[PDB]
Amino acid sequence: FVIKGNEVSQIAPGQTGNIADYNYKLPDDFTGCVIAWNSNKLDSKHSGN
Amino acid sequence: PTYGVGHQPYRVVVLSFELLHAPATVCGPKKSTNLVKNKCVNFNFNGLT
Amino acid sequence: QSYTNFTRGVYYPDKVFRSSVLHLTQD
Numbered sequence: 001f002v003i004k005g006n007e008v009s010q011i012a013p014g015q016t017g018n019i020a021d022y023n024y025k026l027p028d029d030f031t032g033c034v035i036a037w038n039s040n041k042l043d044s045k046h047s048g049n
Numbered sequence: 050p051t052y053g054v055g056h057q058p059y060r061v062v063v064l065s066f067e068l069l070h071a072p073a074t075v076c077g078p079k080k081s082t083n084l085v086k087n088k089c090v091n092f093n094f095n096g097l098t
Numbered sequence: 099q100s101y102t103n104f105t106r107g108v109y110y111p112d113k114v115f116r117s118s119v120l121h122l123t124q125d
């Protein structure tokens with residue numbers, strides 16, 4: 001998925017906010033890796049929605 | 050405080066010690082008695098019985 | 099530097115008293 005930078009720290013077990021709560025949520029008993037990179041070079045245009 | 054039980058901090062203390070070493074001065078809360086000598090007795094010397 | 103060939107350097111591998119025995123140990 002594509003998220004805002006302030007939300008990257010929210011993609012983790014046990015976290016709450018406007019994401020990982022009534023949004024994509026990981027299990028607490030989670031095995032795996034969350035891999036992320038800055039996509040601004042593709043998404044720098046003023047797309048809005 | 051909002052995380053589930055598996056993600057809360059736990060304080061861990063590990064007490065490591067070898068038991069078959071000849072000298073030891075670390076502990077022993079039992080009371081000593083008179084050493085009888087020259088007579089069949091049940092003895093306990095620094096944990097060795 | 100110079101080199102030497104010694105047969106010295108044994109140490110007590112344990113903390114107990116033994117006498118009049120030949121004890122085989124590994125360390």
Ligand SMILES: *[C@@H]1O[C@H](CO)[C@@H](O)[C@H](O)[C@H]1NC(C)=O
Nearest residue numbers: 099100101102103104105106
């Ligand atoms: C070999 O060992 C003997 C006895 O320690 C010593 O006298 C002799 O010089 C040694 N040789 C060499 C080349 O170290």
